[PDB]
Paper text:
Each catalytic domain of PaFS adopts the characteristic α-fold of a class I terpenoid synthase with αα domain architecture: the C-terminal α domain is a prenyltransferase that generates GGPP, and the N-terminal α domain is a cyclase that utilizes GGPP to form tricyclic fusicoccadiene; these domains are connected by a flexible polypeptide linker ~70 residues long. The prenyltransferase domain of PaFS generates geranylgeranyl diphosphate, which the cyclase domain then utilizes to generate fusicoccadiene, the tricyclic hydrocarbon skeleton of Fusicoccin A. Here, we use cryo-electron microscopy to show that the structure of full-length PaFS consists of a central octameric core of prenyltransferase domains, with the eight cyclase domains radiating outward via flexible linker segments in variable splayed-out positions. Cryo-electron microscopy and chemical crosslinking experiments additionally show that compact conformations can be achieved in which cyclase domains are more closely associated with the prenyltransferase core.
Each prenyltransferase domain consists of residues 414–718. The overall molecular symmetry of the octamer appears to be D4, but subtle structural differences confer overall C2 symmetry. Thus, the octamer can be described as a tetramer of dimers. All active sites open inward to the central pore of the octamer, so substrate access to and product dissociation from the prenyltransferase domains is achieved exclusively through the central pore. The more notable structural differences are mainly the Hα-2 and Hα-3 helices that partially cap the active site, which pivot outward in the octamer compared with the hexamer. Curiously, the cyclase domains are not apparent in 2D class averages and hence are not resolved in 3D reconstructions of the prenyltransferase octamer.
Numbering used by the authors:
A (entry chain D), D (entry chain H): 414 to 577, 581 to 611, 624 to 717
B (entry chain C), C (entry chain G): 414 to 611, 623 to 718
Amino acid sequence: HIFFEKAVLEAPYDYIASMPSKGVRDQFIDALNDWLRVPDVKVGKIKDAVRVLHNSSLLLDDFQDNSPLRRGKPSTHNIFGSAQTVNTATYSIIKAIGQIMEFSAGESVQEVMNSIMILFQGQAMDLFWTYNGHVPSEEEYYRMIDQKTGQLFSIATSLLLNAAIPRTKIQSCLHRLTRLLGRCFQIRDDYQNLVDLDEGKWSLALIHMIHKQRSHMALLNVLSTGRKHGGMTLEQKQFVLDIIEEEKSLDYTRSVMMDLHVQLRAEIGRIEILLDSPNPAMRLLLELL
Amino acid sequence: HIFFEKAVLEAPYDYIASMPSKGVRDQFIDALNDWLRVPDVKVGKIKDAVRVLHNSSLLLDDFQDNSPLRRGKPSTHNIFGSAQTVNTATYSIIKAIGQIMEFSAGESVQEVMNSIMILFQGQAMDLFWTYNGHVPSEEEYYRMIDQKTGQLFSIATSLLLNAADNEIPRTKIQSCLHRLTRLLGRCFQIRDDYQNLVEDLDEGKWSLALIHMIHKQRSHMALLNVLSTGRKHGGMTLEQKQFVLDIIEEEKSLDYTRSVMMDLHVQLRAEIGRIEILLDSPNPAMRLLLELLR
Amino acid sequence: HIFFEKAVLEAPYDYIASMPSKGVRDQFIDALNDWLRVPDVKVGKIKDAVRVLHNSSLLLDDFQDNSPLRRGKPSTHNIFGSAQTVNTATYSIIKAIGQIMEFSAGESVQEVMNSIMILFQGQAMDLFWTYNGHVPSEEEYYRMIDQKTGQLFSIATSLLLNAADNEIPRTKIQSCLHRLTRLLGRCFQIRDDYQNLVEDLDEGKWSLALIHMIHKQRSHMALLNVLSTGRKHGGMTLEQKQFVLDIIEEEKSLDYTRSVMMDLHVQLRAEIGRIEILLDSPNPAMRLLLELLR
Amino acid sequence: HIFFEKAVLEAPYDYIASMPSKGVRDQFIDALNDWLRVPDVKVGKIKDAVRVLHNSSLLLDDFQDNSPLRRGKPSTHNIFGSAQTVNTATYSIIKAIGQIMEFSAGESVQEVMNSIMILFQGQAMDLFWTYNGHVPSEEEYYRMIDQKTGQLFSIATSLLLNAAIPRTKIQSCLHRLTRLLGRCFQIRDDYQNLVDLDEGKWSLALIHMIHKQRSHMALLNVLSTGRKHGGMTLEQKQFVLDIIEEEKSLDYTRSVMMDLHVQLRAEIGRIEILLDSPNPAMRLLLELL
């Protein structure tokens, strides 16, 4: 009937939903709801909207990096074919927009529309630097990371500032905290995924090493010419392993995390002092990293 | 520099922005404008957004059906890779959705996006059939063709009408126009099909001819089993493809779509004459659009 | 010398003539003899012909499902090649049909072959489903299982009864016996299935479990799409196979066949008690046959 | 319904039937009906029975020699898979037996049952000599050929002698003509198929050359060791081509045909003189070769 055509379109989403999600986009909102304090009948709807947007982000990601198994279960790219996964991810983002064009928000449609166009620009960069071997710089890797991960919490917050009653004075001093939390969470996720293979999959633990001016040019010319001629040899695979240990990129991630925290605990304090009410939970949210 | 990011993202959509489309969406919009009588500023922004949706559908369709040379240049999938064109298409769809929002919000645009998710339910039906091999019926196949090809004309008309003049009959012509759009989209899909079989796409997709043959009790088993061996071996043969061409030549397949195209053509002709009697004047453009369908 | 031709033809069937079958057709025939009370010359020729049909079905089945090690030796397909085992199987089927003709022709044997062509309509249904991927229903799946596994027991019983004693109730027990055969064959197929899932055959075939899952609206799409990708890539994975095992563990699949096996077991038990009241004495062998079904 | 399960089993047969059959098994019976003169309501049934038996023979053959295209259209082995073609060929022979267990014949069931067991023995030999490289001898190749082709006309005639009224005096002097016509027709078919590739596909035009004691041992050792090590080289493929020309196997087929004819025209004469009625058609049947 109609339920058939409706449950076949939403089948890949129904497969990615049953995954044991970390529950951060649904906890950051629960921690941001301590300050903004929107009604439950609305915060739940916004949580649903950011949840479908993020699950569709995973749907596009798990295909945009060919991986038979993402975590525990097999990857949607490897179960429903590839054409089905793409044609359901696109429908899912449009459905989330229509969910945002509703009670989620009325007049600031351009606000979330632009904050989604940023989310796709910050991803095209990753696909470009992987498909074209064009190694980045930290001034651009941090740009991309904040252009692809933080642009989800940005929509998550820009819709909670459209419902929550002071003024937008917090905005300029609230977005900052959003982008900071987003970058730190991506960095923590990369760290846990590391503790390696290349094949066009950059990270902080690689943009710090491939720019270490000691043995830098050896690196900028080891990946290439080998990634063309097959993939890599066997002593070369150990070479970069021992190279990452040299300057200890794995410790620059620790240092940047030790700076994102002390940047968070001074950025949360801005909100804690703007509104005269502590937040015994958002300070505990930092246990994520 | 954003000047570079904003041009690596748009790069795929720019690659088929200049392809020789020989499209008809433009002619249909310039023919509906003969009735709606909207300012040229409007008929410009509408074409400059429905063309984005169309080219985005091309990226999204001409990639699942991995093709080679298209008009002298290879398919956008093989050049920019699969992962990059998908991201550019998902962005370009949102770019057009944002373009729509700007021109108008009165009379609601929550029914202009609810008319795009239908354009993806249709493609979802098609990509579920071609993948899981489930043969369609005849009514279900017509439903998918209406959902997938005609829905883009439906978006264009539902955006045109929403800023038509604020005069005119308004709603008293809306449902009639929507029926005209459905029949016109169905004809323009079925005509490209009948031109393809004058076949060559037996690698997975489902034309109306295939729906005619697989449903006739004579040789129904044979054709069903041929498609299964094809999808099992990834392409049938140059010999088995000649067998399917001979089934088409046997069951009078090129005579059953013609008897459907020539029927939908007279139906569209009756529909257009019904539009010229609903507080409207002649449209020698629409009757020149039907001539572009053999 | 014919001594060589007559031994290269019989060579494949002789290769599984000594395989450790652990079969049950013999036990069932020796249990039906407890009722029919036929001369041992009969109960010998019957087993020496229904065993030929069974081993021939093995050649014909264990070849389409190209397998490797079977009981410590490879499948008869890989040793003698596909073309040679098929010819030996088609000959051995006719050898058993000719064997049947000899023992008896009164009461007609034109209904003993009409009960073998059913055993091939069943296998034809199975080889059309596994090939063209058409999912079965539940009643159609039970029909195929009755046609394919139970029909060999039906041949044995319709040959036993046709020379049962010329005394006995005769026809007044024929239809009851035929219902007993159908239920017993269905149980012995479903039990081998439930033992296979304590799975490992997701390369094309269709167990009852697969018919339970693909029919439940929850995750019906997921499982259908997994089987399509499997049959498209020729085998799914070691990862996707674990996904199907987790669906089985989720939808309570190993609890729905058990609720069907334990139902068919009580049904068979009631049927056997109904046979002991139809001018017959106890059969402590039949009630020891049911114990060989967990 | 029931028509479904009935038309799926008989679908491969329905595909091999639409082929443009030569129409020999339905013409040999029409030419044998001149002497025996059975009723039409019976000769048609026997023609149907031998037609399904022969179409099932083709079904097993076209799979037992892997060929994507037999003639004009594609091969049943390459359309319905392989498991379907086998499981319909077997059903077709059983159905033909049941058609023979009827009006076709009543009491002489063993006659046609044995004449079908011979038809499968005469084929197992071919599959053995192909699957095992065991080159035959003419004393065995003629045996196999008469054991595989003539055993169809044999059933075609043994059922017309079960309906047709003299005695079985003709039998012993009628079977001979059947087997002679069967061998000559197979030889004519092989000749037309030749006027080559090996891969275990013997013929008269090969059993005559691979036994030509001049260059014989070179042949018995050229095929093997090469058919294992890949297939063949490029000068070797021309070698046997020029070898067949040497002794002219292609002319021993002509000589054996020039003997089968003069053997036929003296075997048909036996029937022509036994019953005092000429046959202006069976003499014209010989135009097949």
